[PDB]
Amino acid sequence: HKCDITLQEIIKTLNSLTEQKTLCTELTVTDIFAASKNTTEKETFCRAATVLRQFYSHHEKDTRCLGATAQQFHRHKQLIRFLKRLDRNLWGLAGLNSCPVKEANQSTLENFLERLKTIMREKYSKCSS
């Protein structure tokens, strides 16, 4: 694949999470699309990194729900270590590093991932990178 395998990695990495975190996906996560009334691609990717970041910290290495079941306790520091890894990938694609997010509707992790995915499957046509 000439394109950047990183993209496919983000989708799979972002997906696997959905399969694992299905119930805990009720921690009402702040949206950001509301400000999509006029933003560029980069601005989007960045804004996405901000949401993911805060989401990581808020829960940090605290097994509040990200696990408490199985294959999650041990892979706890692994999920976080991976989440950040993705953030770094976003930085590469992005380049702003500074992007604000105006609150609005409190979506849900799953909903956030689902929405983000759509945008991914949409821009997927534009590999570039």
Task: Write b or e for each residue in 38-63: b if 16 or more Cβ atoms lie within 10 A of its Cβ, otherwise e.
Answer: eeeeebbbbbbbbbbeeebeebeeee
Provide the 3-class DSSP secondary structure of residue 106.
Answer: strand
Question: Does the CA dihedral 9-32-73-22 come out positive or negative?
Answer: negative
Q: Are 115 and 107 in contact (CB under 8 A)?
A: yes
Read off φ and ψ for residue 30, nearest 5 degrees. -65, 135
Measuring CA to CA, how many Å separate 100 from each of 16, 32, 70, 124? 28, 9, 36, 25
Question: Which pair of structure tokens corresponds to residue 53?
Answer: 């970041």
Split into its structural domains, the chain has a count of 1
Residues 6+ apart with CB under 8 A from 94: 42, 45, 46, 49
For residue 62, give its domain range.
1-129
What's the CATH code of the domain at 10? 1.20.1250.10
HSE-CB for 76 with a 13 A CA cutoff: 14
Burial of 129 from C-beta contacts in 10 A (0-12 / 13-18 / 19+): exposed
Alpha helices in 21-127 (DSSP H): 41-59, 76-93, 109-123
